[PDB]
UniProtKB/Swiss-Prot annotation, chain A:
Pathology linked to this chain's protein: Epileptic encephalopathy, infantile or early childhood, 2: A form of epileptic encephalopathy, a heterogeneous group of severe childhood onset epilepsies characterized by refractory seizures, neurodevelopmental impairment, and poor prognosis. Development is normal prior to seizure onset, after which cognitive and motor delays become apparent. IECEE2 is an autosomal dominant condition with variable age at seizure onset, ranging from early infancy to 6 years.
Organ and tissue specificity: Isoform 1 and isoform 2 show reduced expression in schizophrenic brain. Isoform 3 shows increased expression in schizophrenic and bipolar disorder brains while isoform 4 shows reduced expression.
Domain remarks: The extracellular domain contributes to synaptic contact formation.
Name of the molecule in the record: Gamma-aminobutyric acid receptor subunit beta-2
Glycosylation sites: 2
UniProtKB/Swiss-Prot annotation, chain B:
Highest taxon above the source species: Eukaryota
Protein name, per record: Gamma-aminobutyric acid receptor subunit alpha-1
Quaternary structure, from the entry: Heteropentamer, formed by a combination of alpha (GABRA1-6), beta (GABRB1-3), gamma (GABRG1-3), delta (GABRD), epsilon (GABRE), rho (GABRR1-3), pi (GABRP) and theta (GABRQ) subunits, each subunit exhibiting distinct physiological and pharmacological properties. Interacts with UBQLN1. Interacts with TRAK1. Interacts with KIF21B. Identified in a complex of 720 kDa composed of LHFPL4, NLGN2, GABRA1, GABRB2, GABRG2 and GABRB3. Interacts with LHFPL4. Interacts with NLGN2. Interacts with SHISA7; interaction leads regulation of GABAAR trafficking, channel deactivation kinetics and pharmacology.
Disease: Epilepsy, childhood absence 4: A subtype of idiopathic generalized epilepsy characterized by an onset at age 6-7 years, frequent absence seizures (several per day) and bilateral, synchronous, symmetric 3-Hz spike waves on EEG. Tonic-clonic seizures often develop in adolescence. Absence seizures may either remit or persist into adulthood. Epilepsy, idiopathic generalized 13: A disorder characterized by recurring generalized seizures in the absence of detectable brain lesions and/or metabolic abnormalities. Generalized seizures arise diffusely and simultaneously from both hemispheres of the brain. Seizure types include juvenile myoclonic seizures, absence seizures, and generalized tonic-clonic seizures.
GN (gene name): GABRA1
Domain notes: The extracellular domain contributes to synaptic contact formation. The GABA-binding pockets are located at the interface between neighboring alpha and beta subunits.
Subcellular location, record wording: Postsynaptic cell membrane; Cell membrane; Cytoplasmic vesicle membrane
Family, similarity comment: Belongs to the ligand-gated ion channel (TC 1.A.9) family. Gamma-aminobutyric acid receptor (TC 1.A.9.5) subfamily. GABRA1 sub-subfamily.
Length: 46, 51
């Protein structure tokens, strides 16, 4: 089944995954791009 | 042991179950039927434009 295929793939991806280490721990910096969708600016308080 | 048989049902039900994947992940669109019951309609804040 497709879902079993996906489950196996995700179990593979998360096995041996070290959350302490950023991608490319000993290498070039990881580039992070930011997007914002502003929903509201509520209460500008003096 | 009716509790035991129901425990066995529940354990067999969650065996090999990935809650990270929605039902019909790659082969179907999940349809969520929705219903709202309003037990109270709180006050309306004119100053904050909220309710």
């Amino acid at each position: 089944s497709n879902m079993s295929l996906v489950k196996e793939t995700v179990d593979r991806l998360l096995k041996g995954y070290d959350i302490r280490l950023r991608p490319d721990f000993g290498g070039p910096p990881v580039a992070v791009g930011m997007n914002i969708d502003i929903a509201s600016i509520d209460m500008v308080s003096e | 042991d009716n509790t035991t048989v129901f425990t066995r049902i529940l354990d067999r039900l969650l065996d090999g179950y990935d809650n990270r994947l929605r039902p019909g992940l790659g082969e179907r669109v999940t349809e969520v039927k929705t219903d709202i019951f309003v037990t109270s309609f709180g006050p309306v804040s004119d100053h904050d434009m909220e309710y």
